[PDB]
Amino acid sequence: VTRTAAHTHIKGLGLDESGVAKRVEGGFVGQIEAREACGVIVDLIKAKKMSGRAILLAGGPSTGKTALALAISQELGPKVPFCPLVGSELYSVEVKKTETLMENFRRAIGLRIKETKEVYEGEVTELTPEDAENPLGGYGKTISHVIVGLKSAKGTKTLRLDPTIYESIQREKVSIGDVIYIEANTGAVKRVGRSDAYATEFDLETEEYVPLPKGEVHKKKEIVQDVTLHDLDVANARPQGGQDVISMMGQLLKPKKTEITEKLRQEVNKVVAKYIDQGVAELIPGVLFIDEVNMLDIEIFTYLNKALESNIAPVVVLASNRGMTTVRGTEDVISPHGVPPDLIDRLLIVRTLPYDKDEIRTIIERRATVERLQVESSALDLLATMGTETSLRYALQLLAPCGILAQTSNRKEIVVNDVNEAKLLFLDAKRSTKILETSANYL
Amino acid sequence: VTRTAAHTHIKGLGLDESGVAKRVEGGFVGQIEAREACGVIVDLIKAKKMSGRAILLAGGPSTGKTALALAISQELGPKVPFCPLVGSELYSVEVKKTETLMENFRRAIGLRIKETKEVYEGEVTELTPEDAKTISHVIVGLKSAKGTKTLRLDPTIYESIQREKVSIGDVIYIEANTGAVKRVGRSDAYATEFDLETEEYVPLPKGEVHKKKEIVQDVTLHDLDVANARPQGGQDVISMMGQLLKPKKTEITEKLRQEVNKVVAKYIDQGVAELIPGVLFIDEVNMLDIEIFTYLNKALESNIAPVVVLASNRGMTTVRGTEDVISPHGVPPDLIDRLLIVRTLPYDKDEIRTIIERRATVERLQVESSALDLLATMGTETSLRYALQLLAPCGILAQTSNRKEIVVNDVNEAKLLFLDAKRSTKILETSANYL
Amino acid sequence: KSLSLIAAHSHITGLGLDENLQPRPTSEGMVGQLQARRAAGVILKMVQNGTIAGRAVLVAGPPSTGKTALAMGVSQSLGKDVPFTAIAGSEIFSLELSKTEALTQAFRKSIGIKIKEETELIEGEVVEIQIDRSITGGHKQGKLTIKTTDMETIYELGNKMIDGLTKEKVLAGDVISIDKASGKITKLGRSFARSRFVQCPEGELQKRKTVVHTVSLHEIDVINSRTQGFLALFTGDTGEIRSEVRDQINTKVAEWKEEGKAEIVPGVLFIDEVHMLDIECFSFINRALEDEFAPIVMMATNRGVSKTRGTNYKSPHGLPLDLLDRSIIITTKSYNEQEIKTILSIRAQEEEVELSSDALDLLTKTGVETSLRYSSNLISVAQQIAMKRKNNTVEVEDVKRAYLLFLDSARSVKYVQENESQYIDDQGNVQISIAK
Amino acid sequence: SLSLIAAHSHITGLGLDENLQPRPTSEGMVGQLQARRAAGVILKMVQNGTIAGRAVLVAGPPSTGKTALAMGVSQSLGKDVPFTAIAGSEIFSLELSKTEALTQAFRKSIGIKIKEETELIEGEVVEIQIDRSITGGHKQGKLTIKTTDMETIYELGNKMIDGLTKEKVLAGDVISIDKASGKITKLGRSFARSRDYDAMGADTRFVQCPEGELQKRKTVVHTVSLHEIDVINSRTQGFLALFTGDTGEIRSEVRDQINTKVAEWKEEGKAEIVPGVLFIDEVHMLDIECFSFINRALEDEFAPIVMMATNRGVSKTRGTNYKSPHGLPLDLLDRSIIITTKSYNEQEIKTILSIRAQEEEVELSSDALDLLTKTGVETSLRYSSNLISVAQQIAMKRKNNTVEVEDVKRAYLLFLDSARSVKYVQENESQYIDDQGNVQISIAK
Amino acid sequence: SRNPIKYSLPRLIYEDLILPNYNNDVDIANKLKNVKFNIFNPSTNYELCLFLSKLTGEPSLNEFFRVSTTPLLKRVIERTNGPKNTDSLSFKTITQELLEVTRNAPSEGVMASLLNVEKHAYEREYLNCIQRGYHPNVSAPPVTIEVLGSSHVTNSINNELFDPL
Ligand SMILES: Nc1ncnc2c1ncn2[C@@H]1O[C@H](COP(=O)(O)OP(=O)(O)O)[C@@H](O)[C@H]1O
Ligand SMILES: Nc1ncnc2c1ncn2[C@@H]1O[C@H](COP(=O)(O)OP(=O)(O)O)[C@@H](O)[C@H]1O
Ligand SMILES: Nc1ncnc2c1ncn2[C@@H]1O[C@H](COP(=O)(O)OP(=O)(O)O)[C@@H](O)[C@H]1O
Ligand SMILES: Nc1ncnc2c1ncn2[C@@H]1O[C@H](COP(=O)(O)OP(=O)(O)O)[C@@H](O)[C@H]1O
Known part of the structure; x- marks a missing residue:
C-alpha cells in the first residue's frame, strides 16, 4: 500500500499539554528527558523571538538522534521551514564551504508575503503590428507598437503594447484565438491554451482547450507566497524574469553557485524589513x-562561531555520536563529540540514553505493526533477544526477510523457524567481523 | 588633512653628488653602507643599460628594508615604473604562479608616448548630412561662447552621432584623434520649449570650440600584453553591465610576446616611444615556493627583464616546498649565486631616539625630553616598532586631558593600556585556560 | 529598518565612556573590563581622528570574555557613514579568489x-493629468497640474515625459x-484621499537636495575595471582584479583629495x-598595513602558544612574531560573580524575561561554576518551561529544570568518560549491544 | 631595439671549425672544449634532420655554462628552425594537464x-564604379587603382564587389589585392587625403601612398609548427586560443589526422x-609522471631532439621518496647521452670576465681585472660578473x-657574496628569524 | 519593471572615470591599446596577418583585427559561413564530415540514424507530453542603477539593457 524506510512511525514528540512526555506516544519509546528538551526548544522556536540558539544531540548509535530531528520537524509542521543537512554537504567544488554554510543558514529563514498582481488575460482576437519608418536604421526596433484585442467573459479590451512585451508574447508563439495571460509585474506571459469557442478535433499539436476567463480583462488579485531569504538572494544574484537582455541571457547560462556578497544580503534584508513594516510580509x-556534525573540519566550526552570533540566525540542531575524537583539520586538539570547545561553550548538549530489552521489544512491535506484519510472541521474544544481543538496527532490518520467507511458505504469521533461517541467511556486524578474523585470504 | 602610515617621513636616500650618505638626511637615520649601495643600484637603474640585475637586501626585522626599497622608489621618481609585490601574492587560483611571476615582470617595463589631444565641444547648430542611401559626409557646426566653427565629418562618426541621439541644440564633445563622441546635454537656450521635460539642460562652453593640448602617455608592457589577449573579445566604450561570460586570466603564451615586442621596437625606431x-x-621572498625560484632563475636571463629587488628577514631557514635544503634567508643557493646581498644592521639607542623624534615631528606631536628618553628606553627594551606605535595613543591621551604636550604619565598610562609581544607572552605562559 | 529578532550582542548599544575616555561601571550595555574598554575607546578616537592609517591592534584573552563584544561596541560607537568590515578567519579560503585577493578586497572595503x-527634484501631489493625442499618436500634448500643501502649478509636458x-x-x-534630468518618476503612494497612504509634501516644489554619497574603494575598483560590471559587487564574481587599475583609482582618489571634490x-x-589564516595571509598582512590607503585592522583571537597554520612550530596567539611586533595588544580578563550577575541581568532585561532574585543568584552561581554562555542560554530556555506552568x-524550579534537561561541557564530558564504550572513539570502535 | 644587455648576450653561436674542433676563444664563449664539440655534434644532428627523438643532458656544477652552451647552440641553429626554451616550472599548470603540456612543448619545436x-597589387583607389545587371545576380565592377608612378584599371567580379x-x-x-588568391585587405588611408575629413576617427589609420610598379612578385616562406595547426584545427576561430593560450586539452584524434595529413603533404611535395x-x-623538478611521458614520447616519428639541463647532484626526485643521479630516474637516464661541463681555472675566468667587460662597454685596468679574477676564483663567477657593472657605476660616480682597484674594492665592500652573508648570519643568529620563528627584536637584554 | 534594490552612484565617478572629457585620457588610452599597439593591425603587422591568413585560409586579412576588437555576442550573431580556399592549413575533421552530411538527411539512413540518437530518445520516451515539475520561487530583474542628474547614464543603461541588435 505505502512505502516505509526506517522511519514514518514517528509522528511527533507525543507530549501532553503541560509538556510532560508520555511513555508510548507518537511512535516513541522512552527518551523522556530528551523528548521534554525537544519540546522545550519546540516552544522556543514557536516563540519566534530568538536567533542563534543551538542544541547538540549526543549519544551512541541507534539511540534516536535523527528520529528526534524528524520529530521536531513534524511537530513544527510544514509551515515552518526545515532544512535537513549532512556534514558532507558543505564541501562543494563550485564554491567555498563558508558560502555553502551561509546559504544553508539563509535557507532556513522563511517568509510569507501577500503579493498583489496585475493580470491582463483573455482570448486574443486581433494581432496587428505597426511597422517602423526606417527598419534598417541601426538603432530602434523593427516595429513601433502591437495592437492586441483581448476579450474575456463580459469584457473586451484593446491593448497597445511596446515592442518589449511583444518579444515575450511572440516568444510563446501565440496566435489568433489563443487565450493568454499577461502578468504585468514582470512582463512574463503564459500561453494558456486554445479556446473552445472554435473547433477542437482538428489539431495535431496535442493541444489543450480551456474556456473563456471569467471576470474582466484587467485584474488585481492577491496571491499568498511562501519564499525563503536564500531564494531572494539567488534571484538577485542571478537575475531572471525581466524583459531585458541579461534576463534572457541568465536562463541559458549553466547554473553555478557564486559567493554571494554581504552587501546583497544587507539590501535583501532592508527590502524585507520594509516589506514587513508595511504590514505585507511575515517572517517565519x-x-x-x-x-x-563531526564530519565538519575546523574552519566551518570557526565560521559557525560567527554565524551563530548573527542577528538573522536560525535555530541549529546538531547530532554527533563520538566520545572523545580529534577534530578534523587538526592533529592535537582532542574534543568531545568531535566538536571544538569554543563552539561547545555556545551549545546546549542534550543527552540521549540507550534502550533496555523491553523497549527493544516494543520498538520491534511498533515496527512490525507499521510494516504490516504479524509476528508470533515467541518470535517477538527472539527478536528482543536479537536487539539486546547484537544490535537494535539488525533486529529492525530482519523483519522483512522474515516476512518474505513466511510469504514464500504460504503463511502470514512469522515463527521462530523463520527467524532461525533468517539468521542462517543474513549476518550481522559481529559475526562478519568474527569470520573476518579467522580468514584465509582477506574475506 | 594628512595621512601617515608607517612611512612618508622618508623622501629619499639622502646622498650627496659624490654618492656619500650623510647622518640624518631625507628622513633616514643611520645605515650608511646600505643606503650607499642602494644609491649605486639606483644609478645603475638610471643608466638604463642592464637587464635582469638582481639584488637582495637582508637583515633583521624592523631594520629598514622596506624603507630602503621605498627610498629607492622615491629617488627614481614616478616616471620609472615601480612594482611592489609580496611573495604570497604570486599564488593564484586562476593561473599558475609562474605566469603571475612573468606578468609582474612585464608590469615593471614601461613606455612613454607623446600624444596630442584635440577637442571640439559646443552646441550643435547645423547637422546637415549628404549622400552619394550611403552617406558621403556630414557638415557639423559647433557653437560656444567665443564663436562658432564648422566641421566636416566622416560617416562613422556620423553613425556614432546617430547612436548617441544627437539633435540640433545638444552640447556635444568631439575628440579629433580617436573620434570619441559624448553628449553633454541640450543647450540652456532650448530649456523653455516645454515647461517640464526629461532632458537635462547644460549651459554653453565658455571657452573656444577648438582646444589643443599635448599629453604624455605612460603605459607598461603588461598593459599591451593584456590588450591583445582578451579571450572573450574586445570591450566597447561603456559597459556598465558586465560581460555575460566571466573573463578569467589566461595562460598568455610566449608567441604574443615577441609580436608585442617587435611592435614596440618598430614604434621605438620611429622615435614615438621611449623605453623606461x-x-x-x-x-x-622566503615565502616563495622553489618552483618560483626556478623560474626566477630563467627569467633573469631574459633580454627584457627588469631590476629585481628581494627582501627577507630570515637566517638558516629551510626553503618552502623542500625537506632537507637549509639555505640562507630562505633563498636557494641557485638564486643567491645570481644575487648581490646588501647587509642591513640593527640600531643603537641614539638612532632609535632620533627615529622616534622624527616620527613624532611628522605626526605633529610635541613630546618632552624625559618622555623621549623613556620612549627610547622602551624602544631598546621591547621593540622599535612598539615605541613607534605608542606615539599616537600618547597623543590621544595628551588630547584627553587638554594638553598639547606628551608627558611621562601619558607614556606610563599608554604602556599600561597596550602590551607588546613579550608581556603578552608572559601573560600567556602563566594563564590557565587559553590566556 | 535593520530587522533583527534578538542577537547575542544585541544589548551592546555602545562603549560606555565619559568625555575623558573613562569607562563607566555600567553604561550602554557593557559592564566590566575597564582597561579593555579604555583601550577600545583610544582605538575609536584614533579612527575618529583619521590622521593615521594601517595600525593593527590585537584583542586577546580567555574565551567568552568580552572579545567580540568590544568590536561590536566599537562598530556601534562608530555609527553610520564609516565602513566596518567584519570577516572571519575562514572567510578568505575561496575557490575563485586567492587569499591575497580576498584580503585586498577586505582591506579596500573598509x-x-x-x-x-x-x-534638483520635483516632489508633489498630482491633481489632474490631461493627455491629448492624434489618431496615429504622432504628437502628444499634455498638461499636468500638480500641487503641494503650499503651492500648485500647471506644467506643459513634451512627448517623452508623456x-x-x-x-x-x-x-x-x-x-x-520627478527627476527632471533623468526622467525617473517614482510613485511614493497615494495622499489622504480615500472617499499606500503618505502625507502631501510641503514647501517649494523644486527642492535643491544635497545628497552625501559614501562609497568604498573596492566598489570603484570593479567599476573602473572593464572585465566585470557592477553586478560583481552583488553576485561576488569580481575574479582577481589586477593591480594596474588599483594604482589608477589610488591616483584619482589622491587627485580628488587635492582638488577638494x-x-x-x-x-x-x-x-x-585571526589565528586560522595561513602564514601567506600574515605575510600579506604585515606589508598591507604600510600603505596610506589602509584601515585600522582589529584582530581577535583566544589561542595561546598554538600551532601556526602552514608551519610546524608553535607561536604565541597563533601569529608569528613579526606581526605581533607590528601590533599593539589589548588583553581582556575574566569575570567575577558581580560582573556575571550584571551581565545576566542585562540579558534578562534584553530578552523580556522576568527573573526571581534567588533564580538570578542560582544562575549566577552556575555561570561562575561552569560558563557565562551556558547561563546566557539557560536564561532564555527556562522561560518556556515557566510558560508551560503559565x-x-x-x-528557581524552572532554572533547576532547565539545568537538569540541558547539559553543559563538564557534565557531558563526564558522562562520555563514564560511557566511552557506547560511543565511537578515535579508532572507530563502538559497542552498540547492551548485553555481552 | 628592445633587447638590453642580458645575462649571456655576448654569445653568438658555437665557436667551432669545419672539422668540429672548438676554437679556444671565438664567437663569444671561452673554454669547454669537449662540451663545445658535443654540442656541435648535436648541431649537426639537428641540421641533418634525418633523426628524431634523441635526448641529451648537459650536467654540471652551477655557474659553468650549460645554459650558455644551449644559448650558443640556439644562436648557431639560425633562423627558420624552431627552438623553444621552457623551465621545469612551466609544466605545472592549473586548468591544463601536465602530459599535454609536454605534448605542446614537443609540438612547438x-x-x-x-x-x-x-602577386600583390597595392595602391591607392581613385574610383570604383559598379555595373548592375537587370537580374542583379552578377555585378561587374571597374576599379581605378593608383600608385605614385603609374595607374591602371582592372575589372572585378561579383565576389570582389x-x-x-x-x-x-x-x-x-x-x-x-592578391591576383592569385584574391586576398583583400584595407591598409588604411593615404596621406594625400589626411586634411579632407577634419576629424581622424577610430577604425581607420593613415599610411603613405605606395610607389613603384603596381604588380609586385614576391615569394614568402612560412615556417609553421604543429602546435599552430593543432590549435587552429581544434576550434572554429583558433588564432585567439593560439595567442591567449586557451587551447585546453586538445584531443588525440585531431593530432592523428594532422600527423597523417602532414605526412601525405610531405609525400605530395607541398x-x-x-x-x-x-x-x-x-629538468630535475619535473614529476615522475612527466618523466614517464618524456621517455615514452621520444619514440615517436614527429618528436624533436630534446636537451635538458641539470645542476643537481645525487638528490631526490619529486613525486617519490628515493634519490637518483641528477634527480632523474634510471629509466630516463639510459635514454640519454650525458654531457659534462667542468669547472674553470684562473685563465678562463679572466677571459670570461674580459669578454663580459667588453660587451657591457666597461673598461678595466689590468690590476682591477686581476683582482676580479681572484674574486671569481675564491667566490663564484657571477659575483664578479655583477661586480664589474657595480664598479662601473662607482667609476662614473668618481667621474x-x-x-x-678602488672601485672594485668599494663594490666588494658594499655588496656581499654567499659565504660572507652565511658567516654574518651564523655569527648573529639571535636577531634573525630561525626555523621555529624565534627571534630577538630588541637590542637590550 | 524595476528592481527594488537601488545602487546609488555619485556623478563624479561617472564623469571622471568612464566618460572621456578634456581632463582625462580614457579615449586616448583606448586608442593606444586597441588601435595603434594592436598586433593584428595590417599597417604595422602585415607579416603576422599574412601568416594567419595562410593558416586559417581567410579571404580577408583585416578579419583578425575585426574579431579581436568586437565583443563575443556580436561575433556570435553576425558569424557568416564564408567560403575558404582549399590551399590552406585548415582541415576537415572526421566529426565535421559526419556532421555536415547529416544536416538534411532523412530517416532510415545509416549516418542519419547513427547521428541522431538524442532525438530518438526524445520521441521514444514521450518528452513532448510531460508536465513541468519545478518552477522558481522568486524572480527578479537585474539591479537598477540611479545617478541623480545624468541623462547619459539613463541612455547608456537603456542601450545596454535593451540592445536592439
Ligand atoms: N524512541 C524510539 N521509538 C521508536 N523508534 C526509535 C526510537 N529511538 C530510535 N528509534 C529507531 O532507531 C533507529 C536509529 O535512530 P536514528 O536517530 O535515525 O539514528 P541514531 O539513533 O543512530 O542517530 C531509527 O530507525 C529509529 O526508527
Ligand atoms: N634609517 C632609518 N630612518 C628612519 N626610519 C627607519 C630607519 N630604519 C628603519 N626605520 C623604520 O623602521 C620601521 C621598520 O622598517 P621596515 O623596513 O618597515 O620593516 P623591516 O625593517 O622589518 O623590513 C619603518 O617604519 C621605518 O620607518
Ligand atoms: N562587558 C560586557 N558587557 C556585556 N556583555 C558581555 C561583556 N563581556 C562579555 N559579554 C557577553 O559574553 C558573551 C561572550 O563574549 P564574546 O565576545 O561573544 O565571546 P569571546 O569573548 O569568546 O569572543 C557574549 O555573548 C557577550 O554578550
Ligand atoms: N664557456 C663559457 N664562455 C663564456 N661565458 C660563459 C661560459 N660558461 C658560462 N658563462 C657565463 O656565465 C654566466 C652564468 O653561467 P651559466 O651559464 O648560467 O651557468 P649554468 O650553465 O651552470 O647555469 C652566463 O652569463 C654565461 O654567459
Missing part, C-alpha cells in the same frame, strides 16, 4: 538540522 |  | 570616499517624485579568530 | 616549411619537415672613465 524562522 | 625599464620589488 | 552632490507618465501610471491624487573616510576592518516570573 | 607565390562592400572603401583608401630542439631549464 526555522530549523537547520546538521546530522553528523 | 623599472624596478620590481618583492618582499618576503 | 576605506570610504565621501562625495556630496546636489540635484511616454514616461503613461508608463508607471500616475492618476489623480497620487504623489510622485572628495574626502577620505578611514574605517575599521575586524577579523575575529506564570510570568521565572522561579 | 617541430615545424613544416611552406612557400607560395604572391561583395567583399569590397565589406571593409568599405571610399575612393582614396589604400588596399592590396611542405617539408623542419625539425628543431626542445630545451628544458632545470672617472676606467674601473680601477
